[PDB]
Amino acid sequence: SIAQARKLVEQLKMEANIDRIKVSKAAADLMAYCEAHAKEDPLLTPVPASENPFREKKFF
Amino acid sequence: ELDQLRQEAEQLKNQIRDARKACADATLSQITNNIDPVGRIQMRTRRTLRGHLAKIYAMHWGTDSRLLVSASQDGKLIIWDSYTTNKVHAIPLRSSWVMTCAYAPSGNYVACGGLDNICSIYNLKTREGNVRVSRELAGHTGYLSCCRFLDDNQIVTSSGDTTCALWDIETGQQTTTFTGHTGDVMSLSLAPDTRLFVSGACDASAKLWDVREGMCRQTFTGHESDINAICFFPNGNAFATGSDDATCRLFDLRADQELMTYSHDNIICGITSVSFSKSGRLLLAGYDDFNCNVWDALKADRAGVLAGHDNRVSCLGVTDDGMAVATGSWDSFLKIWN
Amino acid sequence: AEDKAAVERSKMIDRNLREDGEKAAREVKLLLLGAGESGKSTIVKQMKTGIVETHFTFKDLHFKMFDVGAQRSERKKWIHCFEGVTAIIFCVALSDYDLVLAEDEEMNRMHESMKLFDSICNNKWFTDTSIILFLNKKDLFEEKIKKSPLTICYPEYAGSNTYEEAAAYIQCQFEDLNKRKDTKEIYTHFTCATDTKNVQFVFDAVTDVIQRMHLRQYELL
Amino acid sequence: WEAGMSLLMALVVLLIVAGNVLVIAAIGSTQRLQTLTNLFITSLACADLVVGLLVVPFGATLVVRGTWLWGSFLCELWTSLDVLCVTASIETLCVIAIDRYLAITSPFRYQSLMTRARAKVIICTVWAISALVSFLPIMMHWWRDEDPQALKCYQDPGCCDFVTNRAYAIASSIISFYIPLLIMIFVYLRVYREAKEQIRKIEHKALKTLGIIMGVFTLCWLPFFLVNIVNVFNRDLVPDWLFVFFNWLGYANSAFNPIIYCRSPDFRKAFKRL
Ligand SMILES: CC(C)NC[C@H](O)c1ccc(O)c(O)c1
């Protein structure tokens, strides 16, 4: 009980001391990234049928 | 006196809540209002892997994006080859029960773990023998929920005793032990950098554990039910988490808050697995309603639906290349959707 | 050539998987989900870390009995793993009607066992599976009831101090907890430290359960 | 007259083929349905499908035209196929009954002995017995007799009737219907006693479920085989139109069998899916 509460308060004190950025900045960063790496995504944009390994592609 | 400790803990919690609230001056939905929709994403069951004589409980791909492990209660761990759908290895497990698996990146090892509380590590590439029990890690006191490979040598595991561990295979010792969860750890997730890893729980909370230092960096709450799955964002700064409340939530590490919540009135069953596309624009969540939903990442607007199973969708996975999406259900059939 | 070798490997692995699946289906599973102090040790002995598994043969039949009593975790998360067992063995101690839990203050161990039984029987995963109910330490319970009454753990009971009456009362109290009265059946059995017939009763119960399953499959019953 | 029976025969053959092909597809598609008994069910469905494919059409055409218009070779072919298919259906029924009895009376021995390989072996044995009792004795002309009327019917291409001798008639009868009937009666009476005992342990459902299965088969086939075994002793006793009517009534068992042996919830779900 005593040790449990001591560890809890120590963890909370260590957690409260962290730099937090406004949600706007994180949202903008995630948006920019998801925008930049959209072309390479196979599922989002239709991948060429030939390049699609599972449908029809040369295996060896 | 416990009273003073409880009071200072409550004061610190209120301080943290006020700080977070002050940080959240806007909403991701508002910032993503101008963004257009992605469009309907049609997916067909290209390949179907059959052979498991019982329900499937877990699976995992490899860096090759070709091989994929699977787990079944029958007691056989299969290593399918997605391209040709021809079994390449079938390992008979000592324990009939298995609740997870793991395919190390290098591809020179495989893991397994279930109610037996014995994380087994089998070797795949050998000289003459097909498969042998390379090691058996038994330090936990409860059932294992998920295991991941930091590298060929180290392996991090989460157990039902509310304690995560970082075993070293060669030495077979708990190099580090993370504790602090108030409930069972039902799933974890490594980050691309592999330096930090997030861990869910059954007490409706997630913790961002630091591997090297071995301390909890941040804690995220907001769920009304247990967390049954979790997965980082491909960028590595945020992570999505399902739950039993039929609600997925995308938390951020830097801001330390919940960016957005995916939830619809129709869906009522809980989530059992989640994952992100390569670019992370589509969050694929395998619900317990015999279906799988591909939610938009930045607009929380559903897009398409995958329904090809009879029973609940147990495990879901995606390849690093992001070409295919494997889904394993209790129907005893894995489906490589594309 | 390599593709042919791979296909041959796949065929061999499939044949091995089918053979092993048949071998497994031949076996009969059982779940020994009991309380902490339900004399489960005596049962596991007279029959022969983590989950214990006892594989024993009788009358040319293989029984795999699983014991998860050493789990001590949230059962709601892994109970569904046992959906399909041929039955569920539930051990209860008739000598723990006047005792309480060392953790709780005024909760009878019998009441905790009753709650666990109600939880495991009315679960959405065991709607069809049957339940065998072993009652242990019958002589100790007889002596205890000879010394103390039964109104301790039940404030209402119409009956005098006697072994048979109390036995039947506990039996009915345990039986009246299942709601699917028309889908499953409870096979009760009183046992002692030296019974020498427990395996036989388990065999009879399993035979009856399998017969009823086949019947309901063929729609006869 | 013929216009009335044409639609009847057409509907009969269509129902037969539809039911049988549906059952076969249902058992072949889903994996849960791929069980032991479902193998015998598939054998029966395939036999009934062959019936509806080859036998029923020719018989309908014959009865509406009144004479055989194909040829003596095709007449013998059709007769042999009819005999094979009828015997295969009835023997699949009897082996299904034997399987049910073995399983319910002693579950462990049946679970241990029975296997997919042995099921295939038994199905092959049944079909081989059918072939041996249908093709060979027919091809060898041993079914024919010396009655001048029989020879007259044989030489004429039109007459494709089933006039036969005593030996082959009685033999085919006892091997295809009567022994299976006795086996089914005994095994089902035992199963009924077992179900009654079981219910006594723990009220007329089993009685009805068994009465359907048995009485359908009986009322479908017994008349034809009775008249058949009677025709041997003295021909003038029973007319011929009645014989053909009983033959068609027996064929109707081919349509009735699937609905009777594929009524469980699993089959219902598999059918609703497709
Ligand atoms: C009308 C003829 C061609 N059908 C014969 C009938 O189907 C039959 C089948 C099996 C027999 O053993 C039999 O005597 C008679």
UniProtKB/Swiss-Prot annotation, chain A:
Keywords: Acetylation, Cell membrane, Lipoprotein, Membrane, Methylation, Prenylation, Transducer. GO terms for biological process: adenylate cyclase-activating dopamine receptor signaling pathway; cellular response to catecholamine stimulus; cellular response to prostaglandin E stimulus; G protein-coupled receptor signaling pathway. It is a lipid-anchor. One of its GO terms (molecular function) is G-protein beta-subunit binding. Adrenal gland and brain. One of its GO terms (cellular component) is plasma membrane. Coiled coil: none annotated. Its main location: membrane. It is found in: Cell membrane. Guanine nucleotide-binding proteins (G proteins) are involved as a modulator or transducer in various transmembrane signaling systems. The beta and gamma chains are required for the GTPase activity, for replacement of GDP by GTP, and for G protein-effector interaction. G proteins are composed of 3 units, alpha, beta and gamma. In this context, interacts with GNB2. The heterodimer formed by GNB1 and GNG2 interacts with ARHGEF5. The heterodimer formed by GNB1 and GNG2 interacts with GRK2. Component of the TAS2R14-GNAI1 complex, consisting of TAS2R14, GNAI1, GNB1 and GNG2. Forms complexes with TAS2R14 and G-proteins; these complexes play a role in the perception of bitterness. Component of the TAS2R14-GNAT3 complex, consisting of TAS2R14, GNAT3, GNB1 and GNG2. Component of the TAS2R14-GNAS2 complex, consisting of TAS2R14, GNAS2, GNB1 and GNG2. Belongs to the G protein gamma family. This is Guanine nucleotide-binding protein G(I)/G(S)/G(O) subunit gamma-2. It comes from Bos taurus.
Swiss-Prot record, chain B:
The modification Phosphohistidine is found at residue 264. Keywords: Acetylation, Phosphoprotein, Repeat, Transducer, WD repeat. GO terms for cellular component: cytoplasm; heterotrimeric G-protein complex; membrane; photoreceptor disc membrane; synapse. GO terms for molecular function: GTPase activity; GTPase binding; protein-containing complex binding; signaling receptor complex adaptor activity. It holds the Pfam family WD40_Gbeta. Disulfide bonds: none annotated. Phosphorylation at His-264 by NDKB contributes to G protein activation by increasing the high energetic phosphate transfer onto GDP. WD repeats lie at residues 44-92, 93-138, 139-179, 180-221, 222-265, 266-307, 308-338. SMART domains: WD40. One of its GO terms (biological process) is adenylate cyclase-activating dopamine receptor signaling pathway. Guanine nucleotide-binding proteins (G proteins) are involved as a modulator or transducer in various transmembrane signaling systems. The beta and gamma chains are required for the GTPase activity, for replacement of GDP by GTP, and for G protein-effector interaction. Belongs to the WD repeat G protein beta family. G proteins are composed of 3 units, alpha, beta and gamma. The heterodimer formed by GNB1 and GNG2 interacts with ARHGEF5. The heterodimer formed by GNB1 and GNG2 interacts with GRK2. Forms a complex with GNAO1 and GNG3. Interacts with ARHGEF18 and RASD2. Forms complexes with TAS2R14 and G-proteins; these complexes play a role in the perception of bitterness. Component of the TAS2R14-GNAI1 complex, consisting of TAS2R14, GNAI1, GNB1 and GNG2. Component of the TAS2R14-GNAT3 complex, consisting of TAS2R14, GNAT3, GNB1 and GNG2. This is Guanine nucleotide-binding protein G(I)/G(S)/G(T) subunit beta-1.
Swiss-Prot record, chain C:
Its main location: nucleus. It catalyses: GTP + H2O = GDP + phosphate + H(+). GTP binds at residues 37-42, 67-71, 136-139, 193. It is a peripheral membrane protein; Lipid-anchor. The keyword Acetylation does not apply. Its EC number is 3.6.5.-. Keywords: Cell cycle, Cell division, Cell membrane, Cytoplasm, Cytoskeleton, GTP-binding, Hydrolase, Lipoprotein, Magnesium, Membrane, Metal-binding, Mitosis, Myristate, Nucleotide-binding, Nucleus, Palmitate, Transducer, Transport. InterPro entries: Gprotein_alpha_I, Gprotein_alpha_su, GproteinA_insert, P-loop_NTPase. This is Guanine nucleotide-binding protein G(i) subunit alpha-1. It comes from Rattus norvegicus. The gene is Gnai1.
